RNA sequence: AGUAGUAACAAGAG
RNA sequence: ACCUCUGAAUAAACUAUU
RNA sequence: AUCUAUAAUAGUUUUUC
């Protein structure tokens, strides 16, 4: 995690909350192997591609 | 100058032929969606009217 | 609260509930265009065969309780059918007008306050002053002019985003404000409608009104400015000139680019005359901007331009040796330079025309936002000092100094599709053209300008391309820094020398555009064209010589050097290029005398079309000239000796002579006219004697008559395709 | 009949 | 037959006005 | 000095045997 100034809204049981729904849904990605195209794609992913 | 039956005369295909000279080294979709109306031009079909 | 409860009612209905469900915001504007199908086709035909109808107007509903059924006489006012897909009612034109003297009646206080441009022109025409009626050879020129001014500093998209800020500040989408006139007429219009108590779209459409510049293409003679164009039809006809001036306050800036135009016009009429200082002041003397005496203005205000300095030295007046270039008032400190007409191949292959000034020079540089110090060469930028406030500031001097400086990197830098022509073709400033596309994006010029180390002088810092403060390297030549009136003395021929005696301005130094006026010029004289522009100087010059042609003739005839040296003659002599005039005056002269010494070749049409370039001093030389060039509007404009031209045709149908288009007059045959096809004025040395001769070879070229000797007939080119018979006296 | 002119009107629809 | 309804919107560019 | 706002309406221009 980071923020800036180190800055961290709300309290670290939601924050916490936010993590593990995370790691859930890196662990349900991995579990079918779309985890490294994911990761590979973002520096791809702001550029709007007209098709 | 006149000219006699210029658009009875002109070529659907020929307007095709610039665009495609005209889209040189530009991106695809820009050719295709430059290209689409020439092309429905020349497999165009007429309404008789009222009879 | 009403909103949300209306809102809730119609997702309660099926039909508004799925309107609403499926249609998108973008949608909307297609529902909102969405109709049945209104058949109009002929609506002036729909109208004359509606008015006819008992019913032919709709209404609202409410009419059926706010106007009575009846009239006094039973007529009937509305009836309870509704309009196809709407639920409003079918009415009478009887109807309205009971109600515009039976219905109740409301405040109408703050009409002039929303409709203020038209109450505006109202107020103008009702305390405009007319002159007098003159009638004149009209030229007018098809000219981009400004109908609505709108704001100065502002675009319709930048002018539009204000509205928007003003009047619907959560509805401006990410349009953040950059420019300082946009905030500045943001924060006004804001203060000024506080707590105002119009409709907001009525107050946009205000705002639209006000702040919203709207230009279009106009036959415009006159003042270009908005005050002047709304009156156009009043003021300006194909055979006549009705004097007028509004009645409002005159705009600063429009005052100040009119009288630019009449002191260039002005200076450059006088530098042809005998006196140029005489005639410089009589013609200040007899000139008015807009209703207003040239010399009132001259002796107040504060224009820095070189004609209108001129004009000031020549009245006594104390002038500022400096002009303006890009938003900077530049003032040379030292150095010389003599005008010089380069062609240059731009970055975007555009081959243009550019005035380079030779010679070295140093100038100073001072701006609303930075100051800086120039030297410079031919094409050359020998060093800038800028001191400005912040980056963009420096930023925008670096580019102007660039542009000023003429290099020839900056010319290789344009990039893109820079158009150097008007929309109408019509030639533009090559430096303001450069300066406009530098200020939008100049990172090219900036890297292909260079770099250069320097040396740490007075603690001076340095520049980089995507402007930095660099201490180690610069931008070549560039160097970053931090943070008046004189009596003069104006010479005979417009030299204006300083206390010391060193030269600060000169007729050459003004510049050769030839613009136009915002505020109409009104010149009282014999001859009202005398500092009007080309086209009208060249019709009026040659209208002149048609309706004198009686005296002219018989000058012409008798006293050659009288009628070669009146002062009609002038203005059209300041059109001639300046290295030409004595060239062309030599070779008409000569032509003249030829004519006068063969008698029988005496063209009229030729007379008149060669007289006014033998105005000049002349100068001899043997060249011979097939045509002769008039500057008009920067391009030389060639009038052919033999035969007609674009500038100069007559027709021998009508007899009818037209100029530039124009008509100038017709012409009356002389009893001492030729009708025997020979010619005396065409070339400088050889008579025409007849049409095509084989018997003396193969036609030549003009340029090639120097081998001839006296009678050698031979068949020269001359002309647009023609062959003919020439002898050498 | 007339308007009109390369096809219509000389009322149409329910 | 009464009755009832109805009196008819090509494309593109431009110009004018708002 | 530059200068195609957006939109709506009306008007104008744009033919073979
Ligand atoms: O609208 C036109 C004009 O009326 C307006 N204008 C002129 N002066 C003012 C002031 N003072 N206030 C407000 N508005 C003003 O600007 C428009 C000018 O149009 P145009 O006449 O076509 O341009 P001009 O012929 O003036 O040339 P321009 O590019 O603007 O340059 C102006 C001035 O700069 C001189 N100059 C350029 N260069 C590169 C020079 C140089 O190297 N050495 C010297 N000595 N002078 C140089 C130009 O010759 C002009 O004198
Ligand atoms: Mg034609």
Do not use: C, H
């Given at each position: 995690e980071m923020a800036?100034?180190?800055?961290?809204?709300?309290?670290?049981?939601?924050?916490?909350?936010?993590?593990?729904?995370?790691?859930?849904?890196?662990?349900?990605?991995?579990?079918?192997?779309?985890?490294?195209?994911?990761?590979?794609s973002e520096r791809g992913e702001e550029t709007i591609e007209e098709r | 100058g006149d000219n006699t039956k210029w658009n009875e005369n002109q070529n659907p295909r020929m307007f095709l032929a610039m665009i495609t000279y005209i889209t040189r080294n530009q991106p695809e979709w820009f050719r295709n969606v430059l290209s689409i109306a020439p092309i429905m031009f020349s497999n165009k079909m007429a309404r008789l009217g009222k009879g | 609260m009403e909103r949300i409860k209306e809102l809730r009612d119609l997702m309660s209905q099926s039909r508004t509930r799925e309107i609403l469900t499926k249609t998108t915001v973008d949608h909307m504007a297609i529902i909102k265009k969405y109709t049945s199908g209104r058949q109009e086709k002929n609506p002036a035909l729909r109208m004359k065969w509606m008015?006819?109808?008992?019913?032919?107007?709709?209404?609202?509903?409410?009419?059926?309780?706010?106007?009575?059924?009846?009239?006094?006489?039973?007529?009937?006012?509305?009836s309870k059918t509704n309009d196809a897909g709407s639920d409003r009612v079918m009415v009478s034109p009887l109807a309205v007008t009971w109600w515009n003297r039976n219905g109740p009646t409301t405040s109408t206080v703050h009409y002039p306050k929303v409709y203020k441009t038209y109450f505006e022109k109202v107020e103008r025409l009702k305390h405009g002053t007319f002159g007098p009626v003159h009638f004149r050879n009209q030229v007018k020129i098809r000219r981009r002019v400004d109908i609505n001014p709108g704001h100065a500093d502002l675009s319709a998209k930048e002018a539009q985003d204000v509205i928007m800020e003003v009047v619907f500040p959560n509805e401006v989408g990410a349009r953040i404000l950059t420019s300082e006139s946009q905030l500045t007429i943001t924060k006004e219009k804001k203060k000024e409608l506080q707590d105002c108590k119009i409709a907001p779209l009525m107050v946009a459409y205000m705002l639209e009104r006000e702040l919203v510049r709207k230009t279009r293409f106009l036959p415009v003679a006159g003042g270009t400015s908005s005050v002047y164009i709304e009156v156009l039809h009043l003021t300006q006809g194909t055979c006549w000139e009705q004097m007028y001036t509004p009645g409002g306050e005159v705009r600063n800036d429009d005052v100040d680019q009119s009288l630019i135009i009449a002191a260039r016009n002005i200076v450059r009429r006088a530098?042809?005359?005998?006196?140029?200082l005489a005639s410089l002041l009589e013609m200040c003397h007899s000139t008015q901007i807009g209703g207003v005496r040239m010399v009132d203005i001259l002796r107040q205000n504060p224009t820095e331009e070189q004609a209108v300095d001129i004009c000031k030295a020549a009245m006594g007046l104390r002038i500022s040796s400096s002009f303006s270039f890009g938003g900077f008032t530049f003032k040379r400190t030292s150095g010389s330079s003599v005008k010089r007409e380069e062609e240059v191949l731009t970055g975007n292959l555009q081959t243009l025309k550019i005035r380079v000034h030779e010679g070295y020079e140093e100038f100073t540089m001072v701006g609303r936002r930075?100051?800086?110090?120039?030297?410079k060469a031919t094409r050359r930028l020998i060093q800038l000092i800028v001191s400005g406030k912040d980056e963009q500031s420096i930023a925008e001097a670096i580019i102007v100094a660039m542009v000023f400086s003429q290099e020839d990197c900056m010319i290789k830098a344009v990039r893109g599709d820079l158009?150097?022509?008007?929309?109408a073709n019509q030639r533009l400033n090559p430096m303001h053209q450069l300066l406009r596309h530098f200020q939008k994006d100049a990172k090219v010029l900036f890297q292909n300008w260079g770099i250069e180390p320097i040396d740490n002088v007075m603690g001076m810092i340095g520049i980089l391309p995507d402007m930095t403060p660099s201490t180690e390297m610069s931008l070549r030549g560039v160097r970053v820094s931090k943070m008046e009136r004189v009596v003069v003395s104006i010479d005979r021929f417009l030299r204006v020398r300083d206390q010391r005696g060193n030269v600060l301005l000169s007729p050459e130094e003004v510049s050769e555009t030839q613009g136009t006026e915002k505020l109409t010029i009104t010149y009282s004289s014999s001859m009202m064209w005398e500092i009007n522009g080309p086209e009208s100087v060249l019709v009026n010059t040659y209208q002149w010589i048609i309706r004198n042609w009686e005296n002219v003739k018989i000058q012409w005839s008798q006293d050659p050097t009288?009628?070669?040296?009146?002062?009609?003659?002038?203005?059209?002599?300041?059109?001639?290029?300046?290295?030409?005039?004595?060239?062309?005056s030599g070779f008409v002269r000569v032509l003249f005398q030829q004519m006068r010494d063969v008698l029988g070749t005496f063209d009229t049409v030729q007379i008149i079309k060669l007289l006014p370039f033998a105005a000049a001093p002349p100068e001899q030389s043997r060249m011979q000239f097939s045509s002769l060039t008039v500057n008009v509007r920067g391009s030389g404009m060639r009038i052919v000796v033999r035969g007609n031209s674009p500038v100069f045709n007559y027709n021998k149908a009508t007899k009818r002579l037209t100029v530039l288009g124009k008509d100038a007059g017709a012409l009356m045959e002389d009893p001492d006219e030729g009708t025997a096809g020979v010619e005396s004025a065409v070339l400088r040395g050889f008579l025409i004697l007849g049409k095509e001769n084989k018997r003396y070879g193969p036609a030549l070229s003009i340029n090639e008559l120097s081998n001839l000797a006296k009678g050698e007939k031979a068949n020269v080119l001359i002309g647009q395709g023609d062959v003919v018979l020439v002898m050498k006296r």
């Open positions: 800036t100034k180190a800055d961290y809204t709300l309290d670290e049981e939601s924050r916490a909350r936010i993590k593990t729904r995370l790691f859930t849904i890196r662990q349900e990605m991995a579990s079918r192997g779309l985890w490294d195209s994911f990761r590979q | - | 008015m006819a109808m008992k019913y032919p107007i709709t209404a609202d509903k409410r009419i059926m309780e706010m106007i009575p059924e009846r009239n006094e006489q039973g007529q009937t006012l509305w530098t042809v005359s005998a006196d140029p930075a100051t800086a110090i120039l030297r158009n150097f022509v008007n929309r009288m009628l070669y040296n009146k002062m009609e003659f002038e203005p059209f002599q300041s059109l001639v290029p300046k290295a030409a005039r004595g060239q062309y």
